[model samples]
Target: AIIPAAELSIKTLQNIVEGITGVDRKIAIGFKNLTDYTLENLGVYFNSGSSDRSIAYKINAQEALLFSARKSDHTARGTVGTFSYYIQDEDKTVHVMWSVPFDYNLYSNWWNIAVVDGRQPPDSNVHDNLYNGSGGMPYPNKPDQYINNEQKGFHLFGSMTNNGQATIEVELKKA
Candidate 1:
């Protein structure tokens, strides 16, 4: 894979962040921000219902944490760019969003990170719908976005919604 990286990408769950009861049994959808800029506001969105059905309300503790991360890394790299709350073992749809304010007091806005799903937790099978959800850094000459990982992740939570888990990754150069 000699391809360039992206700003907002997806992948299969690789590492274990939380280890509470059902932690291993629950669905895992981790996130990453390998970029050089700090994401002032990082958020995630999901729907319990399907395309044909009405949107379902978020079940407390039953689903992963939403709207939690902020200020990724201030010029640093690879820190606070790992980990995310996992959902209880079930099919689910995930949507990640983030934004940042440029140092020049400009290019401040929100972005839809990625949209994927996980059908059966702790499984290898997965499916994808939208690889990149219009997420790219809007500031300097270099605009960074996310790229999907191979074999490790997919969107497979369709039976209940879509099917599979999403591993979204974001990276930036030192330039």
Candidate 2:
């Protein structure tokens, strides 16, 4: 069954980021940017789905957001980075995509913004296949394209068809 959760506030969710994952101030700030600043910058995408799968929070100890952060101060740092989660497709294949865009372009065009179960009110967890679809974002590809907090916010959502889900496991540490 698909699990629906109230959209947790970034601040409140940050606590969860610290609790279950343990995000420190520096990393938390970046993670916060990833969730809050980035999400807001590209508000168009979230509207595509309401009952979408929950976005998991996690930290990359080996990688630093600051080291990767470019453009603005609020969105997540680093492109070509990976968050700890698995977005499985209906073919039973893992679809791994990057949240950061190839370059910071508000008007950029993307070949595919992390395709899997790209549907509104997505089909949630089910032992058997259920819903399936895809949505396209041509102009505002920054959510899955951009690098920093200002131009792009960090909170990214990835969903799949036939009961697909992505798991976010965060690990926070002090800078």
Candidate 3:
């Protein structure tokens, strides 16, 4: 009789270890979505060229993966909740910082520069301007049914209201 167990190949294990330990390796900054079939075992960050623009990264391996977006301030039509952040392995030590200025929105319908997972652009009454100086704007969490501005797919830890300059710092160190 032979004992059998689930086993991962050497290359696969190496990738996992490298990803976990934050080993010195180059990671291609790109996008990941529901249709993306790659293992995605590698950690990801939002970058504008070479800098890690503060943005949401994936967690839970799968299912609940999402990216942090920001509000767009084009002078004429500025949106809200831009600037996102992510931790990086700088010199083998994980440090926190913001890459890009806040310029994406999870609640802008007219901009259409990015999508907020499961929500649509907030109605005119709920735009950041109207919700200015306000504590909470009350975003709903509904799957399947699309409610504009109602960010879905993941838990709403909180809102990053920077008035168009706030950056979201994401800690990438493994806990």
Candidate 4:
């Protein structure tokens, strides 16, 4: 059964990897919400490089942009986890990180940003090593409610306190 307050919000950070020189690329960002709760804003951080720009996103807003570079391809430096953000009207904040890091492709069109529970497994192509943190997977296994990369869907993994905050971790792999 679907838990009472479990909500999911997905935002794709698209970068400009095509024209940048050296190891840097421009990444494109996107946003989406499958629940009624509104995500007022989000703050995503990368392992390396400085924040090049700031993009505003509304609830399930379509696109946003950010840029970063990798010292080497498919390494820890390229990892994009260690993300932090808060929800609207809720005091709690959600922090996302990975036990196993996934490769944020410098060349790929976009990265799939998922906010699912420990029970949900990331698409191997998009997410590498996903870890189960505080929230356990509450969603029952069913064909209709399954989570994966092909769906391009973003799902939050666990329950939230009245304060409205969470800290989720996952793993990553190269696409």
Candidate 5:
């Protein structure tokens, strides 16, 4: 099951965004953009099929409206990023994914954007996978990919090395 934003205050959601991305002030501004865009041009969809799945959100070729907030402050150069949650019945677990796009020329530092049970950055120290590129920037070739099936909760985190678009996929299966 997915949680509704209306059930919690925007501050709660805002903190979620901040925790996912350590941009602090930029996160607040980016969330403001997301809320405004949601009001102006928002869309929702649901799948009722019993494919053993209660909820699933996927974005293919088209860019999502709510997750399109970009960060342009001096601290970091990247998109505002978005968070999503999912629940599993048989396993009784929860999952989350954070999709983030790094701005062009995001540099080669540790832009601390974190998430749990969702997408994550490609780093050697962060993970066993390592490659040469600006971490988490959305452009050029797709970023490196890694998946760890043995992690749960906040134990999952990542950082980007390439300047391109990246998705922070995480899975909190034991919660």
Candidate 6:
């Protein structure tokens, strides 16, 4: 008497269509230099659904902004992985990578930012200039745990390495 079948909303159907054909996740990545020290050899990297791997966007940070981070699009259904950052301390650079849990399917506005400060350090580690390269950086499948910007509860990533004397602090936020 009643025939019920798979009912997919038009929006979801469109999402599926766009997800299959071609949909670009428009995002703006910003950087904040609140450490009172200049950041060099900086890089921002991310991988979306449509990519075989991730790509790094190199930047020089002396202020709050994004380098070539103009409203860009990642051809994808919003599935992101391996979101990483590389920042210089004094003579060498420290880095961290994260596997983002949020997806474009959840976040329409693919906007996020990274804040580097001088006061706060979550996983502050002192390598004593012993480590020099990205040898064994773990790609944790989660967002940041520091910076304390979680109102609805969301932290993208964070890290602090004591390779230099400045004591760098970095935090990430997703919008």
lDDT of 4 by residue, 54-154 (tens): 53334422222132233344434432333433444444333333221233333211222334322222233212322222233222211112223311133
Give model 2's TM-score versus the native structure: 0.22
**What overall lDDT goes with each candidate model?**
0.24, 0.22, 0.24, 0.29, 0.27, 0.28
State the lDDT of candidate 2 residue by residue for 6-115, as single tens digits. Answer: 32233443443234221111111122222111111111121111211233322122321211111123433322222222221222111222222223333221111222
TM-score of each: 0.24, 0.22, 0.20, 0.36, 0.25, 0.31
Candidate 2's C-alpha runs over 4 A off are 1-4, 12-79, 83-89, 93-96, 99-113, 116-140, 144-175
lDDT of 2: 0.22
The regions of model 3 sitting more than 4 angstroms off are 1-121, 128-136, 139-154, 159-164, 169-175
Model 4 misplacement above 4 A:
1-15, 24-27, 34-37, 57-76, 90-175
Which candidate number would show the highest TM-score if scored against the true structure? Answer: 4
Give the per-residue lDDT of model 3 (tens digit) for 30-100.
Answer: 12222222112223222322222433333222222223333232332322222222212211211111222
**Candidate 1 TM-score over all chains jointly:** 0.24
Higher-lDDT candidate among 2 and 3? 3
The TM-score between candidate 4 and the true structure equals 0.36
Put down candidate 5 lDDT per residue, 1-175, tens digits, no spaces: 2233233233443453445443422221111111111111111111110111222243211122123232444644344222332222222122222223343444332222222333332223222111122243222122243333333332332222233223232222122
lDDT at residue 58 of model 2 (Cα atoms): 23
By summed lDDT, the worst window of 10 consecutive residues in model 4 runs over: 160-169
Stronger candidate by lDDT (2 vs 6): 6
RMSD of candidate 5 to true structure, Å: 15.8
Kindly list the per-residue Cα lDDT of model 6 for residues 53-80, writing each as its tens digit: 2233433333433211111244333433
Off by over 4 Å in 1: 1-86, 104-106, 113-115, 119-175
lDDT of 4: 0.29
Q: What are the per-residue Cα lDDT tens digits for candidate 1 across 1-175?
A: 0122222123222232122121111122223323222222212222111111222233232122221222222332111111112233323333333322223234322223222344221111111112122222111111233333321243312111011111223321111
